[PDB]
Design an enzyme around this catalytic site. Structure first.
Site, PDB file in Angstrom:
ATOM      1  N   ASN A 119      55.698  32.727  47.690  1.00  0.00           N
ATOM      2  CA  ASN A 119      54.512  33.101  48.476  1.00  0.00           C
ATOM      3  C   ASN A 119      53.986  31.971  49.377  1.00  0.00           C
ATOM      4  O   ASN A 119      53.254  32.209  50.329  1.00  0.00           O
ATOM      5  CB  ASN A 119      53.389  33.480  47.514  1.00  0.00           C
ATOM      6  CG  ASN A 119      52.945  32.307  46.634  1.00  0.00           C
ATOM      7  OD1 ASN A 119      53.788  31.625  46.007  1.00  0.00           O
ATOM      8  ND2 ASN A 119      51.627  32.037  46.604  1.00  0.00           N
ATOM      9  N   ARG A 258      41.128  33.033  47.219  1.00  0.00           N
ATOM     10  CA  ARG A 258      40.524  34.169  46.525  1.00  0.00           C
ATOM     11  C   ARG A 258      39.153  34.448  47.108  1.00  0.00           C
ATOM     12  O   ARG A 258      38.400  33.503  47.369  1.00  0.00           O
ATOM     13  CB  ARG A 258      40.394  33.896  45.023  1.00  0.00           C
ATOM     14  CG  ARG A 258      41.703  33.594  44.286  1.00  0.00           C
ATOM     15  CD  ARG A 258      42.607  34.816  44.197  1.00  0.00           C
ATOM     16  NE  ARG A 258      41.955  36.005  43.648  1.00  0.00           N
ATOM     17  CZ  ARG A 258      41.834  36.256  42.348  1.00  0.00           C
ATOM     18  NH1 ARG A 258      42.280  35.385  41.459  1.00  0.00           N
ATOM     19  NH2 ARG A 258      41.251  37.376  41.937  1.00  0.00           N
ATOM     20  N   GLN A 287      38.365  43.608  46.395  1.00  0.00           N
ATOM     21  CA  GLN A 287      39.622  43.766  47.113  1.00  0.00           C
ATOM     22  C   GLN A 287      40.398  44.940  46.513  1.00  0.00           C
ATOM     23  O   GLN A 287      40.619  44.945  45.312  1.00  0.00           O
ATOM     24  CB  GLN A 287      40.414  42.477  46.992  1.00  0.00           C
ATOM     25  CG  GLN A 287      41.674  42.438  47.817  1.00  0.00           C
ATOM     26  CD  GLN A 287      42.180  41.042  47.973  1.00  0.00           C
ATOM     27  OE1 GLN A 287      42.933  40.518  47.120  1.00  0.00           O
ATOM     28  NE2 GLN A 287      41.788  40.415  49.075  1.00  0.00           N
ATOM     29  N   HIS A 311      44.479  41.927  53.079  1.00  0.00           N
ATOM     30  CA  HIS A 311      45.168  40.973  52.266  1.00  0.00           C
ATOM     31  C   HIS A 311      46.664  41.244  52.409  1.00  0.00           C
ATOM     32  O   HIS A 311      47.201  42.156  51.770  1.00  0.00           O
ATOM     33  CB  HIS A 311      44.681  41.094  50.813  1.00  0.00           C
ATOM     34  CG  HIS A 311      45.485  40.307  49.839  1.00  0.00           C
ATOM     35  ND1 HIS A 311      46.025  39.071  50.135  1.00  0.00           N
ATOM     36  CD2 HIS A 311      45.861  40.586  48.568  1.00  0.00           C
ATOM     37  CE1 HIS A 311      46.689  38.625  49.086  1.00  0.00           C
ATOM     38  NE2 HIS A 311      46.607  39.524  48.123  1.00  0.00           N
TER      39      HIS A 311
END
Lengths: 353, 352
Positions: A119, A258, A287, A311
């Site tokens: 990631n 976050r 979210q 996101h």
């Protein structure tokens, strides 16, 4: 073995793009492989409510595969019902949706693995992109073009170069450091970091980084601040009205870490007030962001300074290929009984850290 | 001395931002500097039509121009400018000045620009635009502000810049700085086409490989960026024929000159999927007409457009450099030392 794979439904988008592995339609590209091996794969996006396909299959799932982009909550309650559960995989990176604490504290023999490192580049790129977008005032510039306008002064008046800016990261983990690496040839005035432990001296030097002892002193001298730290007691609600008042006036703030690290209305206020010139990133709390989330409509005094996205930064097609491959690798390690997992991938091994 | 300074009216925006120097309202921040030295400054935006620029041309010692709102220093104007000694570009880009004519006249007119002052600003714009297109940022942000949320609609055409083969047409000041900024993104390879090699050690610093012709360059590139001057070799370079040799689904960035592309050909390539994305801040004609095809063009997904107006070199940082560099040029002239930075010189007393 019975495998429950929980992903979102991509609808027509899965049909448009075969490399979109991370949806229920495309099944991480592992469906035929699992079938040929004799395994039973349940793929579903239905992950909420006691009646859910997820909960229907939990009691006899040997393996559950999850994604941070549509996280199945592997709760205590679900773990207790999952009598055959041996392995939980994150096809990606991020495990807050899994009750690791419960598994470890009980001593249940459940491994939890994720595709560590897969990631990091994707998010680091997104950070540098978002910095550039904000600092250079790209959004209203592009909006002018598509709106059939042309008023250069309206954009220029709030457009800077990233060169000569002081840039601060909160957290210098894998992503924070890769951001700093990417910022080097942009000739910032200085790169700075706050973290709970120091980067090694050689790592610091490779990016010209300077450690600042506390977040207040970090943000005070920064033109640009980026959040690259996990959500925990040290970071929850960190970016609040109080700390924001310590920022440089007209600073730019990026957060791809976050959502909860910020107090959302505090950020919106600060942007609207000029305390922030811009805010951007792809993480929200809650979210998915409700349609009313304040970060959607928030703007600076010029109607800009908003570089928010849904996101998606760590789910580019390139990241999805690494997640899919990494998931296969983990599954092969398990199926063969080698358990030759990449050490960095192990969150818990049979319940142990 | 009489200095005529031709910029544009920023209107209310000039009052909003004090560092917005390149407008008539703010006079490059040199109005007091000039008065203190005993010089007369005429500032105007009126450059078309007995225009105010034309009123003052006959006895201007110095004319200062901006490439963002160019006053054309035409053949006729050169004729009429009886006292003209110096023309300055408060920035970089001299297309609007008839240098060939000045040279031809034998008149002792120096022409200078602030070389190097726009380079980082444009280079950053290029890399930004690459990331914006590659990572599919535009439709992503549009979702948010449209109160939507559908990750798959964005992710289906979003990539990392890592592992991509990236090519620059031109490796001059901007092209090279783009390459420098790309190094830590771990591209599969950085390539360039140019009329001269990068100095060996500069080549090696960015890990660049020279490709001998343009067709071969674009055929292997995931991302192509144009950082070459506009001349005979580049005018209409990016046409339908060349585009058909691009890798299918390539991203193309152009911040050099709009006329290096054939506008309808680029739009066609985007709509057909020959390009996945196009971006940059340069247009032809410029300013872009309201129905300029690059405004509305999209890939099949309704994205792949990262166009902006021509502002990459107009950032407040660049404008400070322009104002300071204009002071430096002027003072070299005023003192009669003519100790110009060699790189700033376009013509020195009419000579190239």
């Amino acid at each position: 073995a019975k495998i429950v794979l929980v992903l979102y439904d991509a609808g027509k988008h899965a049909a448009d793009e075969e490399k979109l592995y991370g949806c229920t339609e495309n099944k991480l590209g592992i469906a035929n492989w699992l079938k040929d091996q004799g395994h039973e794969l349940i793929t579903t996006s239905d992950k909420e409510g006691g009646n859910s396909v997820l909960d229907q299959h939990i009691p006899d799932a040997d393996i559950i595969i999850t994604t941070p982009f549509h996280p199945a909550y592997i709760t205590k309650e679900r773990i207790d019902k999952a009598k055959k559960l041996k392995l939980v995989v994150v096809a990606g990176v991020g495990s807050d949706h899994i009750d690791l604490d419960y598994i470890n504290q009980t001593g249940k023999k459940i491994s939890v693995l994720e595709v560590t490192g897969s990631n990091v580049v994707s998010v680091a790129e997104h950070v540098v992109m978002t910095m550039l977008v904000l600092v250079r005032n790209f959004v209203p510039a592009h909006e002018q073009i598509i709106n059939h306008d042309w008023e250069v002064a309206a954009i220029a008046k709030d457009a800077y170069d990233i060169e000569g800016k002081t840039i601060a990261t909160i957290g210098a983990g894998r992503i924070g450091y890769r951001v700093l690496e990417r910022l080097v040839p942009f000739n910032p005035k200085e790169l700075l970091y706050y973290d709970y432990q120091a980067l090694p001296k050689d790592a610091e030097e490779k990016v010209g980084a300077r450690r600042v002892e506390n977040i207040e002193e970090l943000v005070a001298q920064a033109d640009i601040v980026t959040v690259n730290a996990p959500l925990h007691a040290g970071t929850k609600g960190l970016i609040n009205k109080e700390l924001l008042s310590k920022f440089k006036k007209g600073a730019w703030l990026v957060n791809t870490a976050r959502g909860a690290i910020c107090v959302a209305e505090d950020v919106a206020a600060a942007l609207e007030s000029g305390q922030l010139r811009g805010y951007g990133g792809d993480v929200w709390f809650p979210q998915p962001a409700p349609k009313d989330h304040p970060w959607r409509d928030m703007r600076n005094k010029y109607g800009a300074g908003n570089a928010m996205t849904p996101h998606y930064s760590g789910t580019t097609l390139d990241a999805q290929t690494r997640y899919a491959q990494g998931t296969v690798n983990i599954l092969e390690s398990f199926f063969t009984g080698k358990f030759d997992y990449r050490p960095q991938d192990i969150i818990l091994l049979n319940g142990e850290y």
